[PDB]
Ligand binder design. Structure first.
Ligand SMILES: N=C(N)N[C@@H](CCC(=O)O)C(=O)O
Ligand SMILES: N=C(N)N[C@@H](CCC(=O)O)C(=O)O
Ligand SMILES: [Zn+2]
Ligand SMILES: [Zn+2]
Lengths: 451, 451
């Protein structure tokens, strides 16, 4: 099939009158600027590569916004976590799948074309494994296929309640596997994920939830083709606890004990000192920044300017899913730096003074890297994942090139995303997803059951 | 006319099956909970009082997002201001009116039902007064009437380029009046504003732009029925410069020299020390918080928790209009406190642990007070200004009462606002404004002329 864009963001920059040929398998086959639109579908606005969402816990969308109730003069991430545990304890396989499908539809409508699902809900309500232990992982994949979103599934190794291999809490029972069971699950998922066109990654929940021996064992297991994700340094408390345990900060510890490299996505990485930031940038690992969730949870502000200045790589994730908005994440990534520094125009490159473009370029690349998928760029051989902005919007229609990204990301919003394509298939057209009516009905029923 | 809401937020709290009778002049005449809907228009979702927008400079919407270009390693509010001056210098009366009309339509669609226009663009391109000096003020009123938004017009006294009565810059020439000309303008505006059903307020641009003698003169002029607005303590530089000039901080100076009271709206007030915060709360003045603009400009984070704890009053303004979203302002008001404190659930009351409700209650009241209009509450005798959320949205449909406000403000967004009424007139229905097509066409033409 062929599509035609009057304006599109290609790897070398903005181009005009671009005709794209897309293979039967949804791969970009030919990309020709300054072309004729003969026989191709003329698109309704500016075309961008779709944005990967590099961090998600799908079920949390069901509780999004409901934890905004003061139960203590010093509510924190840790009292929030108790509320999250209460919801996880009651979620059936069917409810989990319904929530995931609805969430992924909403992600697509916002311009997220692929998602890394950081998946730790494994076992039944009693903490016992399903007859096929992959039960819930397979439902995540089925939900992603139903929505039409790209997926890297990251089954999560989770074994302990804290540093030093503390015994898992009853509230964590659904998450728990030893290294052996985890490696078996990981290997068993390869075939069904491959069959669905989905990807896989290795994942440790956090340094609190696994031991150094487990990390070594898993990394030595031969899955060298897979991304590696971990939550790290999100809260000051984890930093303090890590130091009490090892005499090291979390990032410091990881870099001193593990060969962190480009395969890695360090989720949050919020409390990174100058030495830690330098080490991250040198390694080529991707910082998985989840700006709306980090703000919602009161984590803090990442040293993004220092990191970017040293060649750091980053992407964005919606995480707890209080926000499902490429705009909000990139906007408030920048705005957080502005509020901290009390200055404007913080995240730019030496060769790119445009803030919107700097942010979009960065998050596309980091997102594609963290997912381990051939995405993030409209180039021949990469998957046809793209969004079409509103060509009738007066702000966008009056803007060209990088100014258009500034209008969208800093003055605009989600509803300026009109059409979305994943793997060469239209999954959102004029703001609508074909599965939205059925999904919303299933989802509101599930919300009623839970609440 | 009569309307009927299955759920509505009334002054005493959430109520069910509320029938509202609205006078021919758009005033709430009867409000009856647990009623029958016989002969009344059944509304499509939860009903809230409309949100006042207590601070706007309309023309800035035309440049929204375009200033996100690094031109210096330390870009700041002050280099942004130069760019703003370049745009003001080229704006014709017709362009200003087109921008205002389009902006006000967009405000209504977001749920802002009334706006305080902090209006300082007075004179012609040469800095000379129009034949009727009220030329541009009258166009703001005409634009507000065309959109259907409530309006408090705040013509701005602006006389100087800095502390100590420094001579105005050429870039400020369109703003300049002496106290006498300003008072004449203010008095001349009363009749046309009254005729349009609009309101008026006194306004000093900032302590940089006027002298203490001017403040005294204007406040002694007998306009005791009017709100009084001023930008204050927004940037650290103003604090330092104020101290060099007077030996006092900006808020400190204002409270020591002027009888600040409930008539006042202190816009930004960002750099308020503990003594200044206490003085603000004691006075009953309204803090005019413009969260998206303050973040965009790198101003800093207001001590909202300390202020609210002492009975402080606040409202929200869209200001430079990079954002037009009740959701974004209230959400990031709270999130800024969370990022600073590294804690959750910051802005609540002793009698109200629900964060969304605390924020909505606060901003409704502060907004109504700052505008000097009978709004902010669905009570008999107040104007019928309201919004209707999406009753078909699964998050909202599954929620009741204050949980619904948490779903909207912390997990939802602008498109959940479906219908908007101002002065008893429907101005947005199913997300659409009747004037949107004509306005957008005029507006895109104006953008082309400017850019
Ligand atoms: N840290 C965030 N935002 N979320 C975690 C909470 C639980 C934990 O970290 O132990 C999670 O979903 O696993
Ligand atoms: N401070 C903000 N955000 N805006 C001001 C800029 C100019 C000034 O403060 O002198 C204004 O629009 O007048
Ligand atoms: Zn997470
Ligand atoms: Zn202002």
């Amino acid at each position: 099939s062929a599509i035609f864009a009057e304006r599109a963001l290609l790897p070398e920059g903005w181009a005009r009158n671009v005709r794209f040929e897309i293979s039967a398998d949804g791969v970009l086959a030919e990309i020709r600027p300054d072309a004729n639109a003969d026989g191709a579908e003329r698109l309704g606005g500016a075309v961008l590569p779709g944005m990967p969402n590099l961090h998600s816990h799908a079920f949390q969308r069901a509780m999004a916004g409901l934890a905004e109730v003061a139960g203590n003069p010093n509510d924190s991430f840790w009292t929030w976590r108790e509320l999250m545990y209460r919801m996880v304890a009651r979620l059936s396989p069917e409810q989990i799948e319904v929530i995931a499908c609805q969430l992924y539809i909403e992600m697509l409508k916002a311009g997220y074309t692929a998602v890394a699902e950081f998946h730790y809900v494994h076992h039944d309500l009693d903490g016992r494994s399903y007859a096929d232990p992959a039960e819930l992982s397979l439902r995540i994949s089925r939900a992603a296929s139903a929505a039409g979103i790209g997926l890297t599934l990251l089954p999560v190794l989770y074994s302990h309640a804290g540093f030093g291999g503390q015994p898992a809490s009853e509230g964590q029972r659904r998450f728990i596997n030893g290294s052996e069971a985890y490696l078996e699950l990981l290997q068993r998922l390869r075939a069904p994920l491959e069959a669905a066109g989905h990807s896989l990654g290795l994942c440790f929940h956090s340094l609190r939830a696994v031991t150094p021996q487990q990390i070594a064992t898993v990394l030595a297991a031969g899955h060298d083709d897979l991304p590696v994700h971990i939550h790290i340094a999100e809260q000051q408390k984890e930093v303090d606890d890590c130091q009490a345990w090892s005499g090291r900060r979390p990032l410091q510890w990881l870099y001193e004990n593990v060969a962190v490299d480009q395969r890695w996505c360090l989720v949050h990485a919020t409390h990174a000192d100058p030495a830690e930031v330098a080490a991250m940038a040198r390694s080529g690992a991707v910082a998985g920044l989840c700006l709306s969730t980090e703000a919602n949870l009161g984590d803090g502000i990442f040293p993004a300017t220092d990191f970017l200045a040293q060649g750091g790589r980053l992407g964005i994730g919606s995480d707890s899913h209080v926000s499902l908005s490429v705009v909000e994440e990139l906007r408030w990534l920048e705005y957080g730096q502005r509020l901290r520094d009390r200055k404007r125009n913080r995240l730019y490159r030496d060769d790119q003074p445009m803030i919107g473009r700097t942010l979009y370029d960065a998050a596309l690349a980091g997102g594609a890297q963290a997912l381990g998928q051939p995405i993030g760029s409209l180039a021949v051989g990469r998957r046809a994942d793209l969004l079409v902005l509103d060509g009738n919007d007066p702000y966008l229609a009056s803007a060209e090139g990088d100014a258009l990204l500034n209008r969208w990301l800093f003055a605009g919003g989600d509803r300026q995303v009109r059409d979305v394509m994943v793997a060469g298939r239209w999954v959102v057209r004029d703001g609508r997803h074909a599965g939205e009516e059925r999904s919303a009905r299933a989802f509101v029923q599930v919300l009623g059951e839970l609440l």
